[PDB]
């Protein structure tokens, strides 16, 4: 019932990845909510359960498949299915816990991890920060295998955490930020794996704040500037939504849009 988008690392190209991210964005947003040319994800408040999730079915050259479940309100990876087993991150609240009972309902083995799925927690378990975890088609290929073999004992917890970190950035972050999608396209074009630079990391860390600053802005003007980083780690100040239009593709819902004038 929930929409499924397919992607494979097997012979992936810039174009096939671009098609995939475009499809994900299309299933995440309805087109109802666009502010300063930037689409907003659906409001969690009053969102019917039959509209809450999308599924991303990842296949690889190894002929293995996993299905990630993404929450449409924030593009968050809430869990995954591999064959006979499904695994969910520890829910933040009771309504999220109920929500995930609507996912992978025919799976034989349902597990909820005792840990949450935020970067802080995942990096701790991985024993590596995002800045030291390589991204690209190769890492994603390997991540799909690692997720697939977890239930049978083939995948250690740090490798599982690492693999989540890869999937989240190459799917959810790429969906959120055209800039991050661009960085992943480059890695695919040249088949060259590399850890995310500070421009990628700071955008990921700032998604919530950027969403709020845009939505609370006075005609696009931020009350408080937001500091990002360039690829070389130097500071970049954001004062206005205008500079972000080519960078951010989707925002989390943070407030109601003010009336026009």
Question: 121, exposed or middle or buried, with CB in 10 Å at 0-12, 13-18, 19+?
Answer: middle
Cα-Cα-Cα-Cα torsion 42, 46, 49, 55, nearest 10 degrees, comes to 10
* CA separation for the pair 24, 115 (Å, rounded): 26
- Check if 76 is active-site: yes
Specify the length of the chain in residues: 261
> What are φ and ψ of residue 72, in 5° steps?
-65, -20
Question: Is 81 part of any known ligand binding site?
Answer: no
Residue 127 φ/ψ region, left for φ over 0, alpha for ψ in the -120 to 50 degree band, beta for the rest: left
Question: Is 128 part of any known ligand binding site?
Answer: no
Q: This structure's resolution (angstroms)?
A: 1.7
- Check if 149 is active-site: no
Residue 91 near residue 97, CB atoms below 8 Å: yes
- Name the catalytic one among 25, 80, 173, 185: 173
Question: Is 83 part of any known ligand binding site?
Answer: no
Tell me the C-alpha to C-alpha distance, in Å, between residue 147 and each of 6, 41, 78, 159, 167.
Answer: 16, 27, 14, 9, 10
- Name the catalytic one among 27, 130, 162, 176: 176
Coil/strand/helix, residue 143: helix
- Check if 95 is active-site: no
* CA separation for the pair 76, 167 (Å, rounded): 11
Structural biology method used: X-ray
- Name the catalytic one among 35, 44, 110, 119: 119
Question: Is 198 part of any known ligand binding site?
Answer: no
**CA nearest 53: which of 8, 89, 102?**
102
* CA separation for the pair 138, 114 (Å, rounded): 29
> What are φ and ψ of residue 200, in 5° steps?
-70, -50
In DSSP notation, 180-191 reads: HHHHHHHHHHTT
Question: Is 98 part of any known ligand binding site?
Answer: no
């Amino acid at each position: 019932q929930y929409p499924i988008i397919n992607f494979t690392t097997a012979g992936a190209t810039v174009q096939s990845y671009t098609n995939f991210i475009r499809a994900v964005r299309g299933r995440l947003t309805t087109g109802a909510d666009v502010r300063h040319e930037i689409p907003v994800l659906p409001n969690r408040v009053g969102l019917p359960i039959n509209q809450r999730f999308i599924l991303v079915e990842l296949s690889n050259h190894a002929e293995l498949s996993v299905t990630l479940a993404l929450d449409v309100t924030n593009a968050y990876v809430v869990g995954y299915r591999a064959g006979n087993s499904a695994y969910f991150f520890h829910p933040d609240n009771q309504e999220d816990a109920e929500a995930i009972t609507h996912l992978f309902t025919d799976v034989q083995n349902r597990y909820t991890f005792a840990f949450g799925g935020n970067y802080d927690r995942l990096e701790q378990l991985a024993g590596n920060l995002r800045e030291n975890i390589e991204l690209g088609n190769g890492p994603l290929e390997e991540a799909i295998s690692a997720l697939y073999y977890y239930s049978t004992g083939g995948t250690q917890l740090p490798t599982l955490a690492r693999s989540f970190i890869i999937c989240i950035q190459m799917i959810s972050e790429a969906a959120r930020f055209q800039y991050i999608e661009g960085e992943m396209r480059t890695r695919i074009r040249y088949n060259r794996r590399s850890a995310p630079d500070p421009s990628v990391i700071t955008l990921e860390n700032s998604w919530g704040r950027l969403s709020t600053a845009i939505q609370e802005s006075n005609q696009g003007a931020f009350a408080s500037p937001i500091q990002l980083q360039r690829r070389n780690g130097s500071k970049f100040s954001v004062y206005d939504v205008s500079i972000l239009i080519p960078i951010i593709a989707l925002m989390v819902y943070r407030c109601a849009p003010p009336p026009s004038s």
